[PDB]
Amino acid sequence: FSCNVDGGSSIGAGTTSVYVNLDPVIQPGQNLVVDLSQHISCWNDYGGWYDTDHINLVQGSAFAGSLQSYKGSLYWNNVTYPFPLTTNTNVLDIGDKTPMPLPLKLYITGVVIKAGEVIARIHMYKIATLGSGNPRNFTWNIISNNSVVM
Ligand SMILES: COc1ccccc1O[C@@H]1O[C@H](CO)[C@H](O)[C@H](O)[C@H]1O
Secondary structure, rough: EEEEEOOOEEEEEEEEEEEEOEEEEEEEEOEEEHHHHEEEEEEOOOOOHHHHEEEEEEEEEEHHHHHHHEEEEEEOOOOEEEOOOOOOOOEEEEOOOOOEEOOOOEEEEEEOOOOOOOOEEEEEEEEEEOOOOOEEEEEEEEEOOOEEOO
């Protein structure tokens, strides 16, 4: 099982930065959408649904540092969860070698967000089908490319 970010080199586990464009200006009523399907894709390393991968997001996934006070929602694979995540999400099954963009969106409710700032840490868990399933942990550190004001 492997993923990449913005079509980059393969990732089998660990923490990776994911850079996103955010609305440069917001008013207190406005909530920011962060469509992570535009950046993260994963695939089965055999294809053919032979040793199928099972992926979910993990309890404890949350906003980072400054935004710990923020509220939001996390859309994952047909369900919209409160964010930060207080439970593990449903499982997405990955069996094709053709990359699947992750069905993952984050909704977030002067300068409030800095470019280069980690705004959320999303923990993802993988376990396959054969043997022990060779479980792996991924963390996606979501970082804004730009300032967001007000
Ligand atoms: C990059 O690693 C691989 C390269 C080539 C073929 C298989 C590879 O890893 C296996 O992939 C499987 C299907 O995704 C399952 O995820 C196994 O658990 C994992 O060991």
